[PDB]
Amino acid sequence: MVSKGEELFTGVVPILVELDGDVNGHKFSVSGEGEGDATYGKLTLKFICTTGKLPVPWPTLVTTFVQCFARYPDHMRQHDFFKSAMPEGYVQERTIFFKDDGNYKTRAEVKFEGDTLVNRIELKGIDFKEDGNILGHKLEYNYNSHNVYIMADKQKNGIKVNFKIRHNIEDGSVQLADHYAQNTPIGDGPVLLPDNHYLSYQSALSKDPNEKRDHMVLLEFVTAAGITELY
Incomplete structure (x- = not known):
């Protein structure tokens, strides 16, 4: 049978997507729109940026910007936490530690409003270096592929996750962003x-040639795996 x-x-x-952010007192807001196709894991x-120029690099916001759209293969359907929490939704909390720099703390509420899937986010960043890779905009406008390993937190009726993102720096080096997350259902x-x-x-970042506002176009594919002798 198919889950509700x-x-x-x-x-x-x-x-x-709606985000209100404050990083070292630099306040900003971002709106996003598009579509998700969970059958293909496609975003x-x-x-x-509805408040001007973004004060951090766009790639640092990619992980924050709807895991209910991941492709869970049929054989893993009993393990899809994110969809099972719908339509009431779930709250995702993260701390993202930028190595040798500051941290983001994010709280995202993911739920349906009618037929629209909404990702409403508050982001707070502190302890950044005003001349570091983040506030100094030294990160390349690109994105690497990553695996995110997931684990149940039964006592919390939710999931706990940690993973590392490597952002390419313009000098050929890497800026590590170490993510720690908890996801909890909104409903009972x-x-x-x-x-x-x-x-x-996997994620690809691009620009709309006709868009004059500060912006990011994101194409992302997300697929569940790691749980599998029929053949």
């Missing part, structure tokens, strides 16, 4: 608590 949350993701779903999103009903597995991500 699963049913909400069988076709293409419109997405709205297509365009983000616009049952969710699917997964066995250990991972999500495989």
Whole structure:
């Protein structure tokens, strides 16, 4: 049988992203729109800085900007926490430690509003170096592929996750961003608590040639794996 949350993701779903941010007192807001196709694990999103120039590099916000759109293969359907929490949703909390620099703390509420999947985010950054790779905009506008290993936190009726992102620096080096996360359902009903597995991500960043506002176009594919003798 198909899960109630699963049913909400069988076709293409419109997405709205809203972020309010404050990094070392630099305040900004970002809106994003696009669509998700969970069957293919596909996200297509365009983000616009609605308050001017973004004070941090766009790539540092990629992980923050809807894991309910991951492709979970049929054989892993009983392990899809993110969809099972829908439509009431889930709260994602992260701390992102930039090595030799500051940290972001994020809180995201992911839920449906009608037919639209909404990702509403508050981001707070502190202890950044005003001349570091983040506030000094020294990161390349690109993105590497990463695996994210996931684990149940049954006592919290949720999941706990940690993973490392490597952002390319303009001098050929790398800026590590170490992510620690907890996801918790908003509703009081049952969710699917997964066995250990991972999500495989690939991300491509681009620009809209006709867009004059500060912005980012993101194409991202996300696939679950790591849990599998029929052959």
